[PDB]
Amino acid sequence: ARKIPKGVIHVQASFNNTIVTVTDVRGRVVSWASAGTCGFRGTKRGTPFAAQTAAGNAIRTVVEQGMQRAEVMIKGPGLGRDAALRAIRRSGILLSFVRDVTPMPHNGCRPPKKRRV
Amino acid sequence: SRRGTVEEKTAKSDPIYRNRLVNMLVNRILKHGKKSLAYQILYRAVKKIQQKTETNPLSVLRQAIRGVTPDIAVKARRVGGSTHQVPIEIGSTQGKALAIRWLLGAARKRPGRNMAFKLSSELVDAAKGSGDAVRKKEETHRMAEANRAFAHFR
Amino acid sequence: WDGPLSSVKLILQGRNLEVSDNVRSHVEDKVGKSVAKHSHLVREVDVRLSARGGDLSKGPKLRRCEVTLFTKRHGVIRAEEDAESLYSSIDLVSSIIQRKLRKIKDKVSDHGRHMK
Amino acid sequence: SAYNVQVLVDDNENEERLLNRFRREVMRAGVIQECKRRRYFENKQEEKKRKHREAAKRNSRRRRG
RNA sequence: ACACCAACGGCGAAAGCACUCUGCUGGGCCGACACUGACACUGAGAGACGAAAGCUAGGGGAGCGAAUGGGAUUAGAUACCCCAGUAGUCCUAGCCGUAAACGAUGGAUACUAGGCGCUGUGCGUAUCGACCCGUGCAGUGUUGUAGCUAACGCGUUAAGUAUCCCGCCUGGGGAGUACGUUCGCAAGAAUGAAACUCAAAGGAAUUGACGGGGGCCCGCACAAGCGGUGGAGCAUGUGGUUUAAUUCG
Ligand SMILES: [Mg+2]
Ligand SMILES: [Mg+2]
Ligand SMILES: [Mg+2]
Ligand SMILES: [Mg+2]
Ligand SMILES: [Mg+2]
Ligand SMILES: [Mg+2]
Ligand SMILES: [Mg+2]
Ligand SMILES: [Mg+2]
Ligand SMILES: [Mg+2]
Ligand SMILES: [Mg+2]
Ligand SMILES: [Mg+2]
Ligand SMILES: [Mg+2]
Ligand SMILES: [Mg+2]
Ligand SMILES: [Mg+2]
Ligand SMILES: [Mg+2]
Ligand SMILES: [Mg+2]
Ligand SMILES: [Mg+2]
Ligand SMILES: [Mg+2]
Ligand SMILES: [Mg+2]
Ligand SMILES: [Mg+2]
Ligand SMILES: [Mg+2]
Ligand SMILES: [Mg+2]
Ligand SMILES: [Mg+2]
Ligand SMILES: [Mg+2]
Ligand SMILES: [Mg+2]
Ligand SMILES: [Mg+2]
Ligand SMILES: [Mg+2]
Ligand SMILES: [Mg+2]
Ligand SMILES: [Mg+2]
């Protein structure tokens, strides 16, 4: 739909799921891929594999737009942090920078308590 | 088996064709240790399979087994209080075992008259990729792949 | 005795003793309480009664009740009690069964997160 | 904008060296242990526990090796 | 609310105090004779401060989150888990005065091995400025001799050897309750019994047994196979009933 040569890939990795969005430097969202939107549900939705297919699935549409270079944004503690990167690589798209954006409060909102499980 | 592991046993050869393979099959078809009868059954099977088709049965073995050999299956693991079906990959000996087995079972359940006939029929159908023994393997693959997400050793 | 427990076999056996109607009913009650709540798991209830002492033999008047439970999955629930009266004995065995039972329900039926 | 970890891939790129460079960057800032730490709330006690444990762990790992 | 710094580090009487900065101020410690000349130590009553929850009045309200509600789980689940979420948490001005307010160790003084450490300063050395070294103090941490202790342990920061002052204890329940007073807006706090009842209640260490605590390892124990039992008929042993007896074990 939009043919953009260089843009950025945000990959949010949480413990229950990983979202992968594709955007451009203008700060504009083109297309996104979620591990849940690939036909995975709650357990499997966290596994590094569902993150793999999520990444592959976004980069499908990004080569379909014909884009070449990208930056990678990794936000959050989950498993897909490592998994997704692999698919970004094997999907044969040039990797410019890989950054970690996981937000670290410098002090702040007092977290929920500890689950007694 | 907690301590000891298993030594390897001499792989024999079927008398007529000098195969490791055919010998495997006659040992697994065996009941009440009548080897006398089992050989007869297996050979009248080679005879019905040379009857129906003019292709070399020695090869139809290789096709029958290549056809039913699963490369993967699952196994039930207990991981973190969660019971998973984890798709463990299969060794070659185990593959041949599984193979001959599903063959033999699907052969014992057939509608036919003899065991020779049944075994021949299922060898024919498995070599064509046309039968229950194959379908079974594809099911094992279907239920492996759906569970593909649970192999963390991937 | 119970219908919700109809799937359970109540087997009541005097060893050296004669069984009455009041022992019948009392057994059904006290074992009934223990079993009724955990009935989904329970299978067979084996209760043996043993009397000793007084006029029968040497030693105090002991009456001793042994029960045994089986569950669909877990085998072997054993309880042994010694006391004064049959009634007392039974009350005791019930007290024990209850505990072991709900210990089994506790283990498996908790969705216990057992990680290892 | 902001960043924690900067991994710049050159055109010698192969997957495994990249993946592990990045993995050691994350080990280096300690970010995943960090977000397992701020997931829930800790009273001062589990903070003193964590300090003694981790600090004396890496410290005795420095004094043994 | 203050990441990294942060440390078995710093100050404080204790409670506690940490992003940065400035201002008003409390102590501490050290070196010099500069001075006074026993002015000391403790403390019944009394006074001040005193975590958090709580309360009165006014603000404030992101996150979290009693109560509360829904969703589950479970025999039940007024709980654990999830989804929401009010008091409260925050500020100003007060009240409350309780905590495992713990070093479970009242204070002061004197005196009795070391080893290894840190913080502050002082001296001599090293250079002529940072170390460096040896040392003098003041505090703070870990091993340990004498000696102490029921053991564990404590050991110049004593639980050692002595002197002085203060508080407290005199078997366990009943009970930190009742009654009465004092304080408090209340919640409550402080002071604190007796009848009655028991022959125990407690501390430290030991051997076991146990643990839905660890670590190691075995067994046809599970897995992987092959064949059975449970269903059908009979053969047979026991229980139950029956009987004059179904001998007893
Ligand atoms: Mg999860
Ligand atoms: Mg071994
Ligand atoms: Mg101090
Ligand atoms: Mg000052
Ligand atoms: Mg004078
Ligand atoms: Mg006083
Ligand atoms: Mg006050
Ligand atoms: Mg408060
Ligand atoms: Mg109130
Ligand atoms: Mg909440
Ligand atoms: Mg509710
Ligand atoms: Mg909320
Ligand atoms: Mg106030
Ligand atoms: Mg007190
Ligand atoms: Mg005290
Ligand atoms: Mg030095
Ligand atoms: Mg000193
Ligand atoms: Mg000490
Ligand atoms: Mg010591
Ligand atoms: Mg003492
Ligand atoms: Mg008394
Ligand atoms: Mg003790
Ligand atoms: Mg043990
Ligand atoms: Mg053990
Ligand atoms: Mg066995
Ligand atoms: Mg053996
Ligand atoms: Mg088995
Ligand atoms: Mg039978
Ligand atoms: Mg006799």
PDB file of C-alpha atoms in Angstrom, chain A residues 15 73-74 77-78 81-83 85-86 89-90 93-107 110-115, chain D residues 1-15 18-19 22-23 26 29 31-32 34-36 38-43 46:
ATOM      1  CA  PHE A  15       5.456 -12.657  29.211  1.00  0.00           C
ATOM      2  CA  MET A  73      13.254  -1.976  18.797  1.00  0.00           C
ATOM      3  CA  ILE A  74      12.990  -4.481  21.609  1.00  0.00           C
ATOM      4  CA  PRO A  77      11.329  -8.988  29.494  1.00  0.00           C
ATOM      5  CA  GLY A  78       9.605 -11.834  27.631  1.00  0.00           C
ATOM      6  CA  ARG A  81      13.327 -10.833  22.793  1.00  0.00           C
ATOM      7  CA  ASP A  82      15.815 -13.330  21.372  1.00  0.00           C
ATOM      8  CA  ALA A  83      13.454 -15.375  19.129  1.00  0.00           C
ATOM      9  CA  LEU A  85      15.539 -11.226  16.142  1.00  0.00           C
ATOM     10  CA  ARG A  86      16.308 -14.524  14.387  1.00  0.00           C
ATOM     11  CA  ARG A  89      17.559 -11.979  10.240  1.00  0.00           C
ATOM     12  CA  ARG A  90      16.487 -15.079   8.212  1.00  0.00           C
ATOM     13  CA  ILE A  93      16.199  -7.899   5.418  1.00  0.00           C
ATOM     14  CA  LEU A  94      19.215  -5.736   6.197  1.00  0.00           C
ATOM     15  CA  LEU A  95      19.653  -4.986   9.910  1.00  0.00           C
ATOM     16  CA  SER A  96      20.763  -1.433  10.684  1.00  0.00           C
ATOM     17  CA  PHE A  97      20.573  -1.118  14.492  1.00  0.00           C
ATOM     18  CA  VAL A  98      19.190  -3.287  17.261  1.00  0.00           C
ATOM     19  CA  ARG A  99      18.178  -1.378  20.383  1.00  0.00           C
ATOM     20  CA  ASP A 100      16.586  -2.295  23.688  1.00  0.00           C
ATOM     21  CA  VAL A 101      13.808   0.050  24.724  1.00  0.00           C
ATOM     22  CA  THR A 102      12.514  -1.791  27.839  1.00  0.00           C
ATOM     23  CA  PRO A 103      11.398   1.087  30.080  1.00  0.00           C
ATOM     24  CA  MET A 104      13.135   1.328  33.394  1.00  0.00           C
ATOM     25  CA  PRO A 105      11.542   3.640  35.912  1.00  0.00           C
ATOM     26  CA  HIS A 106      14.150   5.573  37.766  1.00  0.00           C
ATOM     27  CA  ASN A 107      11.729   5.421  40.774  1.00  0.00           C
ATOM     28  CA  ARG A 110       4.588   1.365  43.360  1.00  0.00           C
ATOM     29  CA  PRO A 111       4.106  -2.019  41.633  1.00  0.00           C
ATOM     30  CA  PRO A 112       1.457  -4.582  42.490  1.00  0.00           C
ATOM     31  CA  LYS A 113       2.130  -6.841  45.485  1.00  0.00           C
ATOM     32  CA  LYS A 114       3.632 -10.315  45.364  1.00  0.00           C
ATOM     33  CA  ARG A 115       1.359 -13.151  44.291  1.00  0.00           C
TER      34      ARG A 115
ATOM     35  CA  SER D   1      14.089   9.252  21.934  1.00  0.00           C
ATOM     36  CA  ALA D   2      16.132   6.962  24.240  1.00  0.00           C
ATOM     37  CA  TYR D   3      18.049   3.689  24.251  1.00  0.00           C
ATOM     38  CA  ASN D   4      19.391   1.167  26.745  1.00  0.00           C
ATOM     39  CA  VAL D   5      21.412  -1.197  24.558  1.00  0.00           C
ATOM     40  CA  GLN D   6      23.070  -0.187  21.263  1.00  0.00           C
ATOM     41  CA  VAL D   7      23.918  -3.035  18.918  1.00  0.00           C
ATOM     42  CA  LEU D   8      24.969  -1.793  15.500  1.00  0.00           C
ATOM     43  CA  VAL D   9      25.183  -4.543  12.888  1.00  0.00           C
ATOM     44  CA  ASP D  10      27.827  -4.174  10.216  1.00  0.00           C
ATOM     45  CA  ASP D  11      27.591  -5.829   6.780  1.00  0.00           C
ATOM     46  CA  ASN D  12      29.670  -8.826   7.925  1.00  0.00           C
ATOM     47  CA  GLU D  13      26.354  -9.873   9.489  1.00  0.00           C
ATOM     48  CA  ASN D  14      25.657 -13.506  10.339  1.00  0.00           C
ATOM     49  CA  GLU D  15      22.794 -14.414  12.652  1.00  0.00           C
ATOM     50  CA  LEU D  18      24.609 -10.771  16.222  1.00  0.00           C
ATOM     51  CA  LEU D  19      22.202 -12.680  18.478  1.00  0.00           C
ATOM     52  CA  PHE D  22      22.968  -8.566  21.757  1.00  0.00           C
ATOM     53  CA  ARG D  23      22.449 -11.277  24.417  1.00  0.00           C
ATOM     54  CA  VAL D  26      21.332  -7.466  27.821  1.00  0.00           C
ATOM     55  CA  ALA D  29      22.888  -3.939  31.584  1.00  0.00           C
ATOM     56  CA  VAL D  31      17.585  -5.666  32.024  1.00  0.00           C
ATOM     57  CA  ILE D  32      15.552  -8.911  32.209  1.00  0.00           C
ATOM     58  CA  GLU D  34      15.636  -5.898  36.304  1.00  0.00           C
ATOM     59  CA  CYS D  35      12.086  -6.314  34.990  1.00  0.00           C
ATOM     60  CA  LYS D  36      11.636  -9.563  36.889  1.00  0.00           C
ATOM     61  CA  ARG D  38      10.159  -4.575  39.269  1.00  0.00           C
ATOM     62  CA  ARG D  39       7.374  -6.900  38.228  1.00  0.00           C
ATOM     63  CA  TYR D  40       6.152  -7.042  41.863  1.00  0.00           C
ATOM     64  CA  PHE D  41       6.580  -5.018  45.067  1.00  0.00           C
ATOM     65  CA  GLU D  42       9.322  -5.592  47.610  1.00  0.00           C
ATOM     66  CA  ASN D  43       9.403  -4.481  51.218  1.00  0.00           C
ATOM     67  CA  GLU D  46      13.643  -8.503  50.353  1.00  0.00           C
TER      68      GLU D  46
END
